[PDB]
Structure formats: structure tokens, C-alpha cells
Structure 1
Amino acid sequence: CSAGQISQTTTQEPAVNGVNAQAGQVSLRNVHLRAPQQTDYVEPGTTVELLFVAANDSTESNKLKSITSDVGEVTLTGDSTVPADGVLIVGEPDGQIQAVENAEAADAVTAEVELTKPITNGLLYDFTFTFEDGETTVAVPISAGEQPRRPVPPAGPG
């Protein structure tokens, strides 16, 4: 009776770095920050990108995506009202394929944030995604999409 109403397989989040925020009609999937850090912190004043996918649940739509801004002044370049029983893919997560030579509306709604606050990988930073339906804090992580190991200096025994 591992197959009962509470089963391990069904109640599993995706094995992805981005968090999931189902609150609100539009569901946020694989929401993370591309913020390549060269040191302990990503210093304020540097622009890091905000990846996620906004999937519409209802066909009756919530395609506004008004502000979705928090501490950092997230700006949505090439903003569009995409979600209509479909996906709004704000950016290009590492490994993303354009899927066609051309493109629609230039960039596909790329969200970029001027930090105004140090951030580091491993921490969770709250972002308030607000559609016309409602607002939800998501606690976005920092994800190193596909970058390999940065060479750490060799150690001199002492």
C-alpha cells in the first residue's frame, strides 16, 4: 500500500533548480536567477537575468503579468501577454534551443534585475510575481544553469 492516496512518486517536485509557485491562476515553473557570480556575492549594480515559465491553467485570460517586481527592480524587456492556455518563457535557460531561425517580438519577455543588494548562490530571495489575478511571493533561488566548475586555485601544502 505504497500506492495509496499518499504515494512517493506522485508527490515529487521536478528535479530542477528553479522553484515552483502554483499560487494564483498562472503557475510559475522553474523560476530561478541566472546570476553568474565570480566571488562570494553578486555585487549590486550588476544585471542578472530572471528565468521562469508562466503556464496558464484556465482558458477563461490571465495574460497580464503586470509588474512581477521585488527588491531589485525587476524589469521585463520585450514584455508580452503570452499566457493563454500556454507558456510564457521569459528567458533562455542554459540549453534552451531557439526552435526557429526567426523570433517573435524580439526577445521573449526577458526579465532582468539590477540587484541593489548582494546575492550569493545557495540563498533564497523573495520575488513577488503579481498578475492581474493576484500576487505571490516565490522565494526564487540562484541557479548555475550549465556552467562547469570554475577552476579553484591549486593548494600549496603548509
Structure 2
Amino acid sequence: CSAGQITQTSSQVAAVDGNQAGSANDPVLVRDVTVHLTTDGEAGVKFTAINQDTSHTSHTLESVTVDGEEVELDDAEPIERNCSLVADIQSELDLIEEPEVGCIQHVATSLENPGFAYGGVVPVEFVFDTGAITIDATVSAPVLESGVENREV
């Protein structure tokens, strides 16, 4: 009865910070999109652009605009078929390593921190060679080094 057409497992989402756009019949997907802002005022955007399209083309990303000002990308190559573009702030990007097996590109991002509020939502906009994807993304602090972080009190 709980295993019908609407179930409580199939409909579940990523259980992370920041939403996504495009499901099935969309050339480009963005996954796990937030505006990271480090405690000590270092800003950037986290996302992952997947180029999944039947008619294999070139979907290079031109620019990212959070609210009013752009983002410093790192001259990422165009996303090909069965590829990905993982972007984050450099400090949180040194924790992970670029695979040589598939085709995944690591890119660092930065902002000016005009005045984003933790817990707020801002309209991130990606502009590719062909098309733009606009999504509201939350502003959150990056994940802490797990198991080392005690209280000041």
C-alpha cells in the first residue's frame, strides 16, 4: 500500500544544501547550488553542471551572476557528453581530487560579498553559450571538518 505509484522513497531529494534545475528532457543540469560564505567573509558559489543531452553539442559556461556581480571562473573547458563541472571556493576544493577516469573538471569560484545573509535566498543565474538557467539558492557556511569542532562558550 505504501509501495504504490507515489512512495515515500522515490520522491526523496538530495538532502543537501541548495536545490537543482532540470530533470529528464533538459540538456544541462545544475546540482547542489548554494552561495558559500566562509565565517571570515570569503564568498563563492557551489554547483555542478552536468551536460546530458541526446544531440551531443557544446554547452560551455560563459558566466555566473549571483545577484548583481559576476563570479571569477577559472577558464573551464566546455562540458562534453557524460561530463561534469564541479565548482566551489578554492579552500573547499583542495579537500577533493580531480579523477582521471571519467571527465570531471574542478573549478574555483569567488565573489565580493556585497552583503549576503545566512539563511537568505538569492537568484543565481548561469549563462552558457546557448541558454541561461536561473535558480534561487540559499546562502550557507561551508561544511566543517567533521569531528574536530568544539564549542567556545
Superposition TM-score, scaled by structure 2 size = 0.73
Q: In structure 2, what is the Cα distance between the partners aligned to 1:94 and 1:4?
A: 41
CA contact (8 A) 1:71 1:115 kept: no
Give the RMSD, CA atoms, in angstroms: 2.8
CA contact (8 A) 1:55 1:88 kept: yes
1:123 aligns with 2:125: no
1:90 aligns with 2:87: yes
Q: In structure 2, what is the Cα distance between the partners aligned to 1:94 and 1:150?
A: 24
| Larger fraction in strand | 2
Identity, % of aligned pairs? 24
What amino acid sits opposite 2:43 in the alignment?
V
What amino acid sits opposite 2:3 in the alignment?
A
Q: Aligned in 2, Cα 1:90/1:3: closer, same or farther, shift over 3 Å?
A: same
Q: How many residues align?
A: 139
Unaligned runs of 5+ in 2: 100-104
What amino acid sits opposite 1:3 in the alignment?
A
Q: In structure 2, what is the Cα distance between the partners aligned to 1:29 and 1:52?
A: 6
CA contact (8 A) 2:123 2:136 kept: yes
Q: Residues 8-157 of structure 1 correspond to what in structure 2 (within 5 A)?
A: 8-22=8-22, 24-37=26-39, 47-58=42-53, 60-84=56-80, 85-91=82-88, 93=92, 96-99=95-98, 108-116=106-114, 118-147=115-144, 151=151, 154=153
